């Protein structure tokens, strides 16, 4: 037992807590403001400096929304002709909206800072969003245009002709003739609105 060496004094440190120190603080080496959202930082920086600091995020959010309502006011009535061979597609607005909503909700991009900005950035007329989208579903059902691709019946032979973003024409795929209104697509529109 007591043969062979004296018991190392540092053993004491196990039994008496008096000897557990840390001479220095956590970020005392110059990292103190690492935590952006710590009370300590809110005290060091003060509020207006914090505003100055997060302004970039605020204008990110504002940007997403401004794009959204530009696209809405452009494509709101779904069937018109807005350009040379190009015409309005609800689908445009739809897919942008999904991009945004993935910015918030997806687990690959998880950019959730975007949602902390809504109580300020969000436009007062855009608060209803799925309501507006419903109204668009109403406008989308006009009879001169294809139920599927929303191109005009007169001037256009195929679905997705001269649309940059079309789903219905893929690379080495083939062209698809217009589909006609009737009970099928009527209740398609129905179900989407649902």
């Amino acid at each position: 037992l007591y043969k062979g060496i004296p018991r190392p004094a540092i053993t004491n440190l196990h039994y008496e807590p008096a000897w557990r120190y840390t001479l220095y603080q956590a970020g005392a080496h110059g990292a103190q403001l690492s935590n952006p959202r710590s009370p300590f930082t809110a005290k060091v920086l003060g509020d207006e400096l914090m505003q100055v600091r997060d302004i970039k995020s605020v204008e990110h959010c504002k940007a997403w929304f401004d794009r959204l309502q530009y696209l809405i006011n452009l494509h709101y009535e779904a069937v018109g002709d807005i350009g040379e061979f190009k015409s309005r597609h609800t689908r445009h607005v739809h897919e942008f909206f999904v991009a945004f909503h993935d910015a918030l909700s997806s687990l690959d991009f998880r950019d959730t800072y975007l949602f902390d900005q809504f109580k300020a950035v969000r436009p007062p007329e855009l608060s209803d969003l799925f309501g507006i989208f419903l109204e668009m579903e109403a406008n989308y059902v006009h009879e001169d245009y294809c139920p599927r691709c929303s191109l005009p019946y007169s001037t256009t032979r195929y679905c997705g002709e001269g649309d940059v973003d079309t789903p219905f024409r893929k690379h080495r795929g083939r062209w698809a003739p217009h589909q006609k209104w009737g009970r099928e697509w009527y209740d398609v529109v129905a179900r989407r609105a649902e």
């Binding site: 037992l1 018991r7 190392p8 540092i10 053993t11 004491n12 440190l13 196990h14 039994y15 557990r20 120190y21 840390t22 001479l23 220095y24 603080q25 005392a28 080496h29 110059g30 990292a31």
Partner: protein, 89 residues
């Protein structure tokens, strides 16, 4: 390199180099100017050198010390455990 212009003092020799670096007072003055500019650069530069030196030394102080905290606690724990095992022994 060290730039030797054509209007440096020419050396006439067949046994060696054709041009010795020696300066027109103009070239000397010019050199002083350009040099001053560069001085303005390295001032900030090596200033940042010693800044980072203290940064690193400080962060070492803090982290290494924390490491001694945790490690010593470990070492004490093991030593306690050992002498226990020897009481049992």
């Amino acid at each position: 390199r060290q730039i030797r212009p054509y209007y440096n003092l020419p050396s006439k020799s067949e046994h060696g180099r054709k041009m010795t670096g020696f300066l027109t007072p103009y070239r000397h003055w010019m050199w002083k100017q350009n040099e001053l500019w560069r001085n303005v650069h390295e001032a900030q530069f090596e200033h940042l050198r010693r800044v980072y030196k203290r940064q690193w030394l400080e962060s070492f102080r803090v982290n290494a010390d924390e490491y001694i905290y945790k490690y010593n606690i470990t070492k004490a724990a093991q030593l306690a455990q050992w002498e226990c095992e020897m009481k049992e022994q």
